Every structure is written in C-alpha cells, then in structure tokens.
From a paper:
The oral bacterium Porphyromonas gingivalis, a “keystone” pathogen of periodontitis, produces a dual domain sialidase (PG0352). Biochemical analyses reveal that PG0352 can desialylate human serum and complement factors and thus protect bacteria from serum killing.
To elucidate the catalytic mechanism of PG0352, we first determined its unliganded crystal structure using synchrotron radiation to 1.84Å in a monoclinic space group. One of the carboxyethyl groups of citrate interacts with Arg-194, Arg-398, and Arg-460, a triad of conserved arginine residues implicated in stabilizing the carboxylate group of sialic acid. Another carboxyethyl group interacts with the side chain of Arg-213, mimicking the interaction observed between this side chain and the O4 of sialic acid. Interestingly, the tartrate molecule observed in the sialidase active site of their structure binds in a virtually identical conformation to that observed for citrate bound in the unliganded PG0352 structure reported here, suggesting that these molecules may serve as useful stabilizing ligands to facilitate the crystallization of sialidase enzymes.
Residue numbers in the entry: 23 to 523
C-alpha cells in the first residue's frame, strides 16, 4: 500500500559478508541506502549502530563513508572509481551524525572499519555490526534489513580484478600458478565491454606477486583482443620441468560457432623469466582438430578448448591439459581428450577419449602415480554429481571412476589439490555448493582410503562460480574465485585447519 499524503523516504540496509584479512582499511560492515536524497529542509542524519566486543577488539578504527554510488565491494576495491568521503568514528562510539550539507545530496552510507593485525582465523573468527537507527532531524525511519553482517577473517583476502579496473568493464575466468621459485601468476579474461564470452572482444590480463600474495604488480594485458570474433581468453597455466611457464588459451569465434575450416583456435605462449615476458602466441590448433590436422579422423572435428585454470606436469615431464572437444555439428556435446606434449611444448598429441559427454575437466596426480581427472557435469546428467576418471599410463587411456563420485556439481569449473592431512592422503576440490546454482563457493576433502567426501566448507558465501587453487611453498592454500553477480576475481589464502579444524 502506497499512501497519498506526501513522499515516503525508505531506508534499506545490507550487512556485508565478504571475507577480510588483517590490517585492511575501510572494510564495509553495513551499507545503508536512502531511497531519495535528504529533503532540502533537512539538517542532520544520525546513524546508531551495534558492534560486539569481539569485533571491536579486532578493529583499530571505525568510519562512516558517504558516496553517490551504491557499490557491491569495499570502496577501496574500486581504486578511486567510486568517490566517497570518510568520516571517522571513535571505535567505542555507537552513534554518529552528519550535517545534510556534508552529505550533499548523497544517498549511500557505509559503516566501515580498519582491521587490526591479529586473528585466530578459526571458523568463528568473524566480524559483525548492525545499523540500529537512522534518524533525520531526530525522526527515526523504518529500516529494511536485507542481510546480516558476517565477515570471516582469512590469512589473506584480496580482490585482484574488480569491475572497472584498468578501464575493463568486467572480469571472468581465473587462473593461478605458483612457480618453483615462489612467484605467483594470476591471469583472467579482461572482459572489456560486458561479461559475455567469445565471440565477444576479450583480452588476457596478468598480475604477478613475488612475496607470496602480499602485494601484486599492476595488471598487464599480455594478449590483446582485436575485435568481435578476434578476442582471446580461457587461460590455463603450468610450469614445465625445464622451468618455463606455459599458458594455453583460445581465441576467435565462440565455441559453438567454431568449425573445421574456420576454428576457434588454441594458442600457447611461454615465459622463461617468471612471467615478466611472454612469447608471441603460437597456434597449435592443427595438432588437435580441423582442416590442418594431420590425423584425418580429427580433421572434421569442430572445436576444442582446454579447461581454464591449471594443467598438470607429470613426474616424467609430460605436460598435460584436458581438452573438451566437439566432434559433431549435429549436437551440443563435448568429449574429453588429454592434450599433451613430451617435448616441452614443441609438438602436441591427443590421448584416447577420456570421457563422453564431458565438459571442462582437470587433472591431479594421485599418490601412487595414477592420474585423476575431474569432469564438469554439463546438462544436469545422471544424479547431478561431479564426474571422475582414472589413468594409470600417464594420461593415454582412461576409465570412469565412480568411486570418486559423491559431491554435487551444479555445472561449474573448479580445481583440485592433492594434500596430506593428519597423515592421510586426500584431495581438496573447489566447487560452488549450489544446489543447482552458482552460489556459495566451497571446498571438500576426499579421503583416498575410505573413499568418502567430507561435508563442504563454504569459503565465500553468495554468488560464486569458477575457482582455481594452488599450494604455496609454506603449505597455505591459494584460492582464486569468481565472487558476485558482476564478478570480481578474489585471491584467498588459508590453511586447511582454518576451514576443517
């Protein structure tokens, strides 16, 4: 019901549940939106709030931020693209007021905090606050609460690619690599004009860290899209046994538009200096499929792409990525084959078929030397579970491995890590929890000996999609995930006990 005796200002508020890390500045705890500007006759807005002792103990300062923009992420994540004023509050106070002139017509208010240096990082190590009152010239307004605040502390948490960064509207498709020397390489689709895939015009962008993810270089475009049907994306990364970094990606038309005579092409580029410089992209499509393929039985295949994220370099030195290949123009179906090189990338071959009606697939090395492959469930097949397969000949031949099944896949890319926990060999697997949607990015542990999956632990609640993972030299896990409906690519660091103990 809407009344007809004047204008009705409405107040909406959201508690924040993005992760945080020690020493971060101006982290949003609660956002408040007015439905309209303060009336011209207004003089002051007062905001009262609650903040428990445990959160107060973990912050060094509080602020009221005021912006003309209603932003999804912490305001410094937009690097000045969101303009805001910052009004300090003693961390002991529970109310604050601003003149209407200071507010200057703006509608969006952020209760924010500087995070202190300490944390235990346990599941219970979370920050919260609540806005309790919003009053204009002493008159309280009814508050519409849409979410509670709960920000979990992680050993590291940083949005590496945020919509607008560098002038790119959007970002998707995370890939992370740790080199033998400890360098971290983070790549992404720089989705410059919107969030859609090829044949849209897309670049590949990179950031590097030489201090374990504490700080990151300015983003660099390393492969520039040149127009619709001429973009590049879907990066996967390895480091070869010789030490060179190898990135594989696709470019051109979209997957379902690719044909044998006009393919969406697969390229590789290498770095011999920890990701500083990269070789001009080399087209390797002819090793895989299409009119230039020397295997006549693959010359009529239509499309191929390797799963974004990471490949796998075997102890022998064989370099592997799983391709998802379209063999027929009649159907929207893909089959998986391992794309591999035994000569440091000079030439490439295909395994026997690893999975029928597959999709983006990933490899990891079992403790006994076998290769485990994890296949995305496309089209809600069977019981909507993640699919698995095993190879005992270093990836040449495959058999379905139903014993690894037991986790739901809403239909999304994810990653695995082989880990040892309390003396047991286990596989960590990242996926959205769903169910049946891109929501709540989670990790699970599979115990090799019992054949049982753990309960999931949600790393990032809310909208969540592709994830990649790497082991850092000191045993911490780096988790690189698509957060939000308008995606930011976020790098989170934790140890397993932080999530499962």
């Amino acid at each position: 019901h809407h009344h007809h005796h004047g204008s009705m200002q409405e107040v909406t508020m959201w508690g924040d549940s993005h992760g945080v890390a020690p020493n971060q500045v101006r982290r949003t705890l609660v956002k408040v939106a007015l439905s309209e500007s303060l009336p011209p006759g207004a003089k002051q807005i007062r905001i009262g709030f609650s903040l428990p002792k445990e959160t107060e103990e973990k912050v060094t300062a509080l602020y009221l931020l005021v912006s003309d923009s209603l932003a999804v992420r912490d305001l410094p994540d937009y690097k000045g693209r969101v303009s805001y004023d910052s009004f300090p509050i003693s961390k002991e106070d529970r109310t604050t007021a601003l003149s209407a002139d200071s507010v200057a017509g703006r509608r969006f208010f952020y209760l924010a905090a500087d995070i202190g240096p300490v944390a235990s990082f346990s599941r219970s190590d979370t920050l919260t606050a609540r806005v309790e009152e919003v009053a204009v010239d002493g008159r309280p307004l009814p508050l519409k609460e849409l979410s509670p605040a709960s920000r979990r502390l992680y050993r590291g948490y940083e949005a590496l690619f945020v919509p607008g960064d560098g002038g790119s509207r959007n970002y998707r498709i995370p890939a992370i690599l740790k080199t033998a020397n400890g360098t971290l390489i983070a790549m992404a689709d720089r989705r410059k004009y919107n969030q859609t895939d090829l044949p849209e015009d897309i670049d590949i962008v990179m950031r590097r860290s030489t201090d374990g993810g504490k700080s990151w270089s300015d983003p660099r475009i390393i492969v520039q899209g040149e127009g619709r049907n001429h973009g590049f994306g879907d990066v996967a990364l390895v480091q070869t046994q010789a030490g060179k970094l190898l990135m594989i990606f696709v470019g051109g038309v979209g997957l379902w538009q690719s044909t044998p005579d006009r393919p969406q092409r697969t390229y590789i580029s290498e770095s011999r200096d920890e990701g500083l410089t990269w070789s001009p992209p080399r087209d390797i499509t002819h090793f895989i499929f299409g009119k230039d393929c020397a295997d006549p039985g693959r010359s009529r295949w239509l499309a191929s792409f390797c799963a974004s994220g990471q490949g796998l370099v075997l102890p022998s030195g064989r370099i592997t990525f799983v391709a998802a290949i379209r063999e027929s123009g009649q159907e929207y179906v893909l089959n998986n084959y391992v794309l591999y090189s035994d000569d440091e990338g000079d030439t490439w071959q295909l395994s026997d078929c690893a999975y029928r009606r597959g999709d983006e697939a990933k490899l990891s090395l079992m403790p006994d030397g076998r290769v485990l492959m994890s296949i995305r469930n496309q089209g809600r097949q069977e019981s909507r579970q993640r699919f698995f397969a095993l190879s005992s000949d270093d990836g040449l031949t495959w058999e379905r491995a139903k014993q690894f099944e037991g986790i739901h896949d809403p239909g999304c890319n994810g990653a695995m890590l082989q880990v040892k926990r309390n003396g047991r060999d286990q596989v960590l697997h990242s996926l959205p929890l769903g169910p049946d949607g891109r929501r709540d990015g989670a990790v699970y542990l599979f115990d090799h000996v019992s054949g049982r999956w753990s309960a999931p632990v949600v790393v990032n609640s809310g909208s969540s999609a592709y994830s990649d993972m790497t082991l850092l030299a000191d045993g911490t896990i780096g988790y690189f995930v698509e957060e939000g409906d308008e995606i930011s690519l976020v790098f989170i660091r934790f140890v397993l006990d932080d999530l499962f103990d």
